[PDB]
């Protein structure tokens, strides 16, 4: 067995298939970051750091010796525990199709939110700079009126053009901004369609982020490094409940500072 | 023979084909529910209940015995009798093509209305909770002005987005609401087209329901269980008329409470 | 895995084989009901109810609609927990052949007693009418003197003959009555042999029932429906003991009211 200790969990095979399906579905729906960044293959469990290729000056060991430390970025392992009713698990073999997988959905939504907020806003404790912090283009303010959203977005499209950047540009919106441009309409279309006319990429719902992000998806600018992708593991169990977790280990690198514009309220 | 006792009816083969065609046509046109819910294969005549996979605590038979009743949902058999003129039946072999099949059409419309109102509004006596009652998302009020319909509908699309739900969303309208958004026009399109722009599913005419329903058609959320599909059976006959019936047996299950928004006036 | 969670139990393979053998043996010895009634194949875990084929009038949904609920009988799941010493379990691999399987035997005897008392005396909470309650033939009183038992039994054989019934008749006795007709002797035979001369079926020891039952075993009159047959499942464990259970899910149907005579004290 492995670190998931999956065979020790009192979960049947059919219940496991339903839990895997629910977690994978809810996660994909709430991920916006993997649609725009380069996603590496999983390094594996032993992978601990990503080389940046830079060098750090250290106090010379002896006379005439020049020493340099190799710089690297550590992976962070992110774990979201959740708790399942054993009655709901037992219902699945009897043929129930409405078993309560709400904790699985909440854990997948929380893991997806962490991953997206780590990619776009950073996680300083894990030495990850967000796309918002690593952007060299000027930051823009989103207006109160949703009918004035496409104007400011177009100004962001000016800045990537002034930065000398090609590629399909894509706009990612926070859930508040996505709702505002979805529910306001002008001439038989919502403002989301007006945003769709400005770019050759995609208007992407990004419920974890704040504000908005416009960026190129030409490739090679944004890199998500995975040691291991999302997995479900077993912690402990009692007569009534099974404690499990969702787990993934990653770091994020931004190679190109001028490939994005961040917007705030 | 079977319970339809079809060979006992004084109905010719050509008249039977015309009656089957008329009933099937009028039924499909008036069904909205089967276009959005999962429809099972017919279980057969012996099928009487659907297992929910839950358990009900009962008074222990003896000391040290723990007993539980299996929960289930009963099927309901729905029968709509109708009466045909025997002269109209006899006209068909002579080559008439305008035989009065109005009772067949009224029976098919009434059966379709019952089935749709059972799916969406429930039938408490048959222990069926409607989609409106089983929805956990908040209910919305439809405005008087049809030009303000697409706004409220978009708010419903917000709620399924706040519920964490994917899939093609579909809007079902009552006949009053469908007529109102069909006959009012803005900038060369009726408001029905404005509703069509908001979703990737379908604006569906639902003449049996009240208000409106917005819901996902991703699958696995709404399940119509059929023991036997719609069939035409023979009751009795006299010199002038043949009494027949339309009959179907079903139950409806909603597995996912947050997959729909109900709207009312 | 399944709902038994059998691989989670700290029970070795040899100990499992001994427990299965002990439970199966003790159960068969104490079952009288399956020897006389028709026993269906196991429906499976999803099976929840048995269709009776009857209809229940319900308040018409709308005008001109006639509705009927399908009648059914729910299965009941019967669980008898028991507790095993882990030292006795560990003794089996070392080669012990006298490991204390008394709790297994007591659980099998209790499960068998419940099943037989459910078949013959009913379980109202599970909507099961016993053979004694569903019999339309008159009830008889068993006499105090065991030498007068065969007389009354013969009167019961008159009643099935007056009911117009064929087939091998079988007599089932309570443990008190079986002991009384076993230990009293007349002319070199016990009274049990005198009972054996009256029927072409079998004198059957039935320790769970009260009184006596005479009935035909021609087939098709008494039906035991099993969703799942007797199985051993794992609940929980500590350093000293393993909690397990015996479990079976069933209902009982009596189709023929005049196929039996019940006797009481």
Coordinates of C-alpha atoms in Angstrom, one line a residue, chain C residues 20-257:
Chain C
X20 CA -18.7 -19.8 9.0
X21 CA -19.0 -23.6 9.6
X22 CA -20.3 -23.1 13.2
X23 CA -22.9 -20.5 12.2
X24 CA -24.2 -22.4 9.2
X25 CA -24.4 -25.7 11.1
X26 CA -26.2 -24.2 14.1
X27 CA -28.6 -22.2 11.9
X28 CA -29.7 -25.2 9.7
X29 CA -30.4 -27.3 12.8
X30 CA -32.7 -24.7 14.3
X31 CA -34.5 -23.9 11.1
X32 CA -37.8 -25.6 10.6
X33 CA -39.5 -23.0 8.4
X34 CA -37.3 -23.4 5.2
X35 CA -38.0 -27.1 5.1
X36 CA -41.7 -26.5 4.4
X37 CA -42.1 -23.1 2.7
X38 CA -40.9 -22.1 -0.8
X39 CA -37.7 -20.2 -0.5
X40 CA -36.8 -17.8 -3.3
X41 CA -33.4 -17.0 -4.7
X42 CA -31.7 -14.0 -3.1
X43 CA -32.9 -10.8 -4.8
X44 CA -29.8 -8.9 -3.9
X45 CA -28.9 -5.9 -1.8
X46 CA -31.0 -3.4 -3.8
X47 CA -34.2 -5.4 -3.4
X48 CA -36.5 -3.6 -1.0
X49 CA -40.1 -4.8 -1.6
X50 CA -42.1 -7.6 -3.1
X51 CA -45.0 -6.7 -5.3
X52 CA -48.3 -8.2 -4.3
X53 CA -50.1 -7.2 -7.5
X54 CA -52.9 -5.4 -5.7
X55 CA -54.0 -1.8 -6.1
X56 CA -54.9 0.9 -3.5
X57 CA -57.4 3.7 -4.2
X58 CA -56.0 7.2 -3.8
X59 CA -57.5 10.6 -3.9
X60 CA -57.8 11.6 -7.6
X61 CA -55.0 13.9 -8.7
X62 CA -57.3 15.8 -11.0
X63 CA -60.7 15.6 -12.6
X64 CA -61.2 12.5 -14.8
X65 CA -58.0 10.9 -13.5
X66 CA -58.2 7.6 -11.7
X67 CA -55.2 6.8 -9.6
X68 CA -54.1 3.7 -7.8
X69 CA -51.1 2.9 -5.7
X70 CA -49.3 -0.4 -6.3
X71 CA -49.3 -2.5 -3.1
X72 CA -46.1 -4.1 -1.9
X73 CA -44.5 -5.8 1.1
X74 CA -41.3 -4.3 2.6
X75 CA -38.3 -6.5 3.4
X76 CA -37.0 -6.4 7.0
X77 CA -33.3 -6.7 7.7
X78 CA -32.6 -8.7 10.9
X79 CA -29.2 -8.3 12.6
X80 CA -27.9 -10.2 15.6
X81 CA -24.7 -8.9 17.0
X82 CA -22.3 -11.1 18.9
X83 CA -18.9 -10.8 20.5
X84 CA -15.8 -13.1 20.1
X85 CA -12.7 -13.3 22.2
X86 CA -9.6 -12.5 20.2
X87 CA -7.6 -15.1 22.1
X88 CA -10.0 -17.8 20.8
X89 CA -9.5 -16.5 17.3
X90 CA -5.7 -16.5 17.7
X91 CA -5.9 -20.1 19.0
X92 CA -7.2 -21.4 15.7
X93 CA -4.0 -20.8 13.7
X94 CA -1.9 -22.5 16.4
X95 CA -4.1 -25.6 15.9
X96 CA -6.7 -25.4 18.6
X97 CA -10.0 -27.3 17.8
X98 CA -12.0 -26.3 20.9
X99 CA -12.1 -22.5 20.4
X100 CA -15.1 -21.0 22.1
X101 CA -17.7 -20.4 19.4
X102 CA -20.6 -20.2 21.8
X103 CA -21.5 -16.6 20.9
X104 CA -21.6 -17.6 17.2
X105 CA -23.9 -20.5 18.2
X106 CA -26.1 -18.2 20.3
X107 CA -26.4 -15.7 17.5
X108 CA -27.3 -18.4 15.0
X109 CA -29.9 -19.8 17.3
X110 CA -31.4 -16.4 17.9
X111 CA -31.4 -15.5 14.2
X112 CA -33.1 -18.9 13.4
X113 CA -35.6 -18.3 16.2
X114 CA -36.5 -14.9 14.9
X115 CA -36.9 -16.1 11.3
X116 CA -39.1 -19.1 12.3
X117 CA -41.2 -17.0 14.7
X118 CA -41.6 -14.4 11.9
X119 CA -42.8 -17.1 9.4
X120 CA -45.2 -18.8 11.8
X121 CA -46.3 -16.1 14.3
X122 CA -45.8 -13.0 12.2
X123 CA -44.1 -9.6 12.8
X124 CA -46.7 -6.9 12.7
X125 CA -44.2 -4.0 12.6
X126 CA -42.8 -5.5 9.4
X127 CA -46.4 -6.0 8.0
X128 CA -45.9 -9.8 8.1
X129 CA -48.9 -12.0 9.0
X130 CA -48.0 -15.3 10.5
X131 CA -49.2 -18.7 9.3
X132 CA -51.2 -18.9 12.5
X133 CA -53.0 -15.6 11.9
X134 CA -53.4 -16.1 8.1
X135 CA -54.9 -19.6 8.5
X136 CA -58.6 -19.9 7.7
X137 CA -59.0 -23.4 9.2
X138 CA -60.2 -23.6 12.8
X139 CA -57.6 -23.6 15.6
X140 CA -57.3 -26.6 17.8
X141 CA -56.3 -27.1 21.5
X142 CA -53.5 -29.5 22.3
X143 CA -54.3 -31.8 25.2
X144 CA -52.3 -32.1 28.4
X145 CA -51.8 -35.9 28.0
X146 CA -49.2 -36.6 25.2
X147 CA -51.0 -39.9 24.5
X148 CA -54.0 -37.8 23.3
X149 CA -51.8 -35.7 21.0
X150 CA -52.1 -38.0 17.9
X151 CA -55.9 -37.8 18.2
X152 CA -56.1 -34.0 17.9
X153 CA -53.4 -34.0 15.2
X154 CA -55.7 -36.4 13.2
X155 CA -58.5 -33.8 13.6
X156 CA -56.2 -31.2 12.1
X157 CA -55.7 -33.7 9.2
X158 CA -59.5 -33.8 8.9
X159 CA -59.6 -30.0 8.4
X160 CA -57.1 -29.9 5.5
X161 CA -59.2 -32.7 4.0
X162 CA -62.3 -30.7 4.5
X163 CA -60.5 -27.7 3.0
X164 CA -59.9 -29.6 -0.3
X165 CA -56.1 -29.8 -0.1
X166 CA -53.7 -32.4 -1.5
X167 CA -49.9 -32.9 -1.0
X168 CA -47.6 -34.4 1.6
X169 CA -48.7 -33.0 5.0
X170 CA -46.1 -32.1 7.5
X171 CA -46.3 -31.6 11.3
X172 CA -44.2 -29.1 13.1
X173 CA -44.0 -29.2 16.9
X174 CA -42.8 -26.8 19.5
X175 CA -39.9 -28.0 21.6
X176 CA -42.2 -28.6 24.6
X177 CA -44.6 -30.7 22.5
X178 CA -41.7 -32.5 20.7
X179 CA -40.1 -33.4 24.0
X180 CA -43.5 -34.6 25.4
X181 CA -44.2 -36.9 22.4
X182 CA -40.6 -38.0 22.3
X183 CA -40.3 -39.0 26.0
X184 CA -43.7 -40.7 26.4
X185 CA -43.8 -44.2 24.9
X186 CA -46.6 -46.6 24.0
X187 CA -46.0 -50.3 22.9
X188 CA -42.3 -49.9 22.2
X189 CA -42.5 -46.7 20.3
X190 CA -42.6 -43.0 21.4
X191 CA -45.6 -41.0 20.4
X192 CA -43.5 -39.2 17.8
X193 CA -43.6 -42.5 15.8
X194 CA -47.4 -42.5 16.2
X195 CA -47.4 -39.0 14.6
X196 CA -45.1 -40.3 11.9
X197 CA -47.6 -43.0 10.9
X198 CA -50.4 -40.4 10.4
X199 CA -48.6 -38.3 7.7
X200 CA -46.5 -38.9 4.5
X201 CA -44.5 -35.8 5.3
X202 CA -42.2 -35.3 8.3
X203 CA -42.4 -34.7 12.1
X204 CA -40.3 -31.6 12.3
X205 CA -38.7 -30.2 15.4
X206 CA -39.5 -26.5 15.6
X207 CA -38.1 -25.0 18.8
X208 CA -39.0 -21.4 18.1
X209 CA -42.8 -21.8 17.5
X210 CA -45.6 -22.2 20.1
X211 CA -48.0 -25.1 19.9
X212 CA -48.1 -27.1 16.7
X213 CA -48.7 -26.6 12.9
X214 CA -50.0 -29.2 10.4
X215 CA -49.6 -28.1 6.8
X216 CA -49.2 -29.2 3.2
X217 CA -45.9 -29.0 1.4
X218 CA -47.3 -29.4 -2.1
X219 CA -45.7 -26.0 -3.1
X220 CA -46.9 -22.6 -4.0
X221 CA -48.7 -21.9 -0.7
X222 CA -46.1 -20.3 1.5
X223 CA -43.3 -18.1 0.1
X224 CA -40.2 -16.8 2.0
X225 CA -38.6 -14.0 0.0
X226 CA -35.0 -13.3 0.6
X227 CA -33.2 -10.2 -0.5
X228 CA -29.9 -11.5 1.0
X229 CA -29.4 -14.9 2.8
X230 CA -27.5 -15.2 6.2
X231 CA -24.2 -13.4 6.2
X232 CA -21.6 -12.5 8.8
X233 CA -20.4 -8.9 9.0
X234 CA -17.9 -7.0 11.0
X235 CA -18.9 -4.1 13.3
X236 CA -15.9 -3.0 15.5
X237 CA -13.0 -4.4 17.5
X238 CA -10.7 -3.7 20.6
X239 CA -7.6 -5.4 22.0
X240 CA -9.7 -8.2 23.5
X241 CA -12.8 -8.8 21.4
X242 CA -14.3 -8.6 17.9
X243 CA -17.9 -7.5 17.5
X244 CA -19.5 -9.1 14.5
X245 CA -23.1 -9.8 13.5
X246 CA -25.3 -12.2 11.7
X247 CA -27.6 -10.6 9.2
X248 CA -30.4 -11.5 6.8
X249 CA -33.1 -9.6 5.0
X250 CA -36.5 -11.2 4.2
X251 CA -40.2 -11.0 4.1
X252 CA -42.8 -13.8 4.3
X253 CA -46.0 -14.2 2.2
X254 CA -48.8 -16.7 2.7
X255 CA -50.8 -17.1 -0.5
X256 CA -53.2 -19.9 0.6
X257 CA -55.2 -19.4 3.7

